Design a protein around this ligand. Structure first.
Ligand SMILES: [Ca+2]
Length: 448
C-alpha cells in the first residue's frame, strides 16, 4: 500500500520521469513533490523558484512538453505528482522570467498592481501579535497577492485545474500561513474535484496565525515533528518517543505531513541546528527509520543535493541520470530516497499499513527502543554505545525474516540479500544490534 512520498528538490523533469520508472514505482513511493513548474525569475539560486512571473510551465525544470511527459510516465509507473503551488505572492522587484516574460512594479503578464495588497513589510514580531500584517504584508519583499479578489482566485484556480487536466494529483500550497484560511476556502470552491492538498504552515507555538486554522482545507505540515524528532535524537532519550504525536501536542495524525527535514529547514529557515539532515549520516538513517516505522502522519522523504555550506546555491550542474551513470551519494545529488535504511523504512511502512497501532513497546529507559505494528511487523533501534541484545516480544509468526533495512527478499523468497532475523516459536526475538544500527521486519519479507 502506498504510504510515503518524496521531495525531489530541484530535480529536472527528465530525471524525475526516469526516477519514477526505475526506482520510485518499483520501491513503492506513493508520489513525488516537484519544485515549482511555473515561470519564475532567472538566476541560479534555488529560491528563484519561489518568485513566480506567470503560470506558464517553462521553468528551470524544463518546458511544458517535458513536464507533461513526466506526469504521464510517472503515472504509468504508479507514482503521483504533487505540484508546489505559490498561492501567496509573485516575484519581488523587476526583471525577466524563464519564459521570456518581463515584469516590474507589481506589473506581471497576468496581474496588475491592483491585484496585490498595498505594500508593507512583515516584521518578525508580527508573527506573534499581528495576523493582519502576517497575511496582508510582504514576505521578504514578495508582492503579496490579494487572495480575497475573485480575479486572483480564478487565476490560481485555473492554473490548478489545468494541472489536474494534465494529470497532476496533488498540490503543496506554499506559504499558506500568509494567506487567510477563508481565502483558501474560497479558492478551493473553484478547484475541480478533490485533489490531495497539503499546506505549508510553520507553527511551533505562540503564533498569531495557527496551523489548526488550515485543517478544513487539507493536510498541514507539522513542523513540530521535524524539530522534536531532531531534538530527541540528538539531545534526548528515544524512550520518550513512546507516545510521540498528539500526545506531544501535535495536530491530528490524519491531518499531518511529517518529515525529518525539508528544503528550508536543512538550510536554517524554520529550523535550528538540531534538525537532522543528510550531513548527519547514520543519525539521519536512524531518524528516518523511526519516522517511517511509527504510525503518525503522512511522511515525506527528503532528497537533497550537497550544497557545500552555501545556503543560497542551486543544484548540481549535472543530471542525476548522466549517460548511464547515476550521480547519487557523493558531492552532487545525495539521493536519500535510495539510501538502504530509508528505502527499507518505506518498505516497512508500506507493508504494515493494515495495522496502525504501536504494539509491545520496549525501551531501556534511554536510547534503545523496539516496537511492533501488531503481527504485520516489528522494529528496533540501538542508539547506545553497546550492543542491544535484549529479548523482545512480538506478535509475529515464527520463522526467518529479512532485515529490510539492510537487504531484501529474493523473487523466489528463498533468501535475503542482508541479515536474517529469527522470530522464535513464542514470538520473541533475541536481538543482536550493534551501536547506532537498527532492524525492521514485516510479514511480507518472510523466508521460504
Ligand atoms: Ca498574503
Amino acid at each position: 500500500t502506498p504510504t510515503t512520498f518524496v521531495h525531489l528538490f530541484e530535480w529536472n523533469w527528465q530525471d524525475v520521469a526516469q526516477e519514477c520508472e526505475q526506482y520510485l514505482g518499483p520501491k513503492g513511493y506513493a508520489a513525488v513533490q516537484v519544485s515549482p513548474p511555473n515561470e519564475h525569475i532567472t538566476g541560479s539560486q534555488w529560491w528563484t523558484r519561489y518568485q513566480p512571473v506567470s503560470y506558464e510551465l517553462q521553468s528551470r525544470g524544463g518546458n511544458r512538453a517535458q513536464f507533461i511527459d513526466m506526469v504521464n510516465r510517472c503515472s504509468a509507473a504508479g507514482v503521483d505528482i504533487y505540484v508546489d503551488t505559490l498561492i501567496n505572492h509573485m516575484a519581488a522587484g523587476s526583471g525577466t522570467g524563464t519564459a521570456g516574460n518581463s515584469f516590474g512594479n507589481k506589473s506581471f503578464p497576468i496581474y496588475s498592481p491592483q491585484d496585490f495588497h498595498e505594500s508593507c513589510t512583515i516584521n518578525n514580531s508580527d508573527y506573534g501579535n499581528d495576523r493582519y500584517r502576517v497575511q496582508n504584508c510582504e514576505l521578504v519583499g514578495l508582492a503579496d497577492l490579494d487572495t480575497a479578489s475573485n480575479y486572483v482566485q480564478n487565476t490560481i484556480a485555473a492554473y490548478i485545474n489545468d494541472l489536474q487536466a494534465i494529470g497532476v494529483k496533488g498540490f503543496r500550497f506554499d506559504a499558506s500561513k500568509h494567506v487567510a484560511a477563508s481565502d483558501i476556502q474560497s479558492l478551493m470552491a473553484k478547484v475541480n474535484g478533490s485533489p490531495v492538498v497539503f499546506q505549508e504552515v510553520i507553527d511551533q507555538g505562540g503564533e498569531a496565525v495557527g496551523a489548526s486554522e488550515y485543517l478544513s482545507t487539507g493536510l498541514v505540515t507539522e513542523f513540530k515533528y521535524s524539530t522534536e524528532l531532531g531534538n530527541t535524537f540528538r539531545n534526548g532519550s528515544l524512550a520518550w518517543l513512546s507516545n510521540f504525536g498528539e500526545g506531544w501536542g501535535f495536530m491530528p495524525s490524519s491531518s499531518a505531513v511529517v518529515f525529518v527535514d525539508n528544503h528550508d529547514n536543512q538550510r536554517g529557515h524554520g529550523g535550528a541546528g538540531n534538525v537532522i539532515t543528510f550531513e548527519d549520516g547514520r543519525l539521519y538513517d536512524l531518524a528516518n527509520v523511526f519516522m517511517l516505522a511509527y504510525p503518525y502522519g503522512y511522511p515525506k522523504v527528503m532528497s537533497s543535493y550537497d550544497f557545500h555550506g552555501d545556503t543560497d546555491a542551486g543544484g548540481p550542474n549535472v543530471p542525476v541520470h548522466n549517460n548511464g551513470n547515476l550521480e547519487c551519494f557523493a558531492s552532487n545529488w545525495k539521493c536519500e530516497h535510495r539510501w538502504s535504511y530509508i528505502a527499507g523504512g518505506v518498505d516497512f511502512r508500506n507493508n504494515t499499513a493494515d495495522n496502525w497501532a504501536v504494539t509491545n513497546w520496549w525501551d531501556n529507559t534511554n536510547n534503545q527502543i523496539s516496537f511492533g505494528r501488531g503481527s504485520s511487523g516489528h522494529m528496533a533501534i540501538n542508539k547506545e554505545d553497546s550492543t542491544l541484545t535484549a529479548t523482545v516480544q512480538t506478535d509475529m509468526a515464527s520463522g526467518q525474516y529479512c532485515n529490510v533495512l539492510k537487504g531484501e527478499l529474493s523473487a523466489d523468497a528463498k533468501s535475503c540479500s542482508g541479515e536474517v532475523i529469527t522470530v522464535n516459536s513464542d514470538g520473541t526475538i533475541n536481538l543482536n544490534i550493534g551501536a547506532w544500527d537498527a532492524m525492521a521486519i514485516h510479514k511480507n519479507a518472510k523466508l521460504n
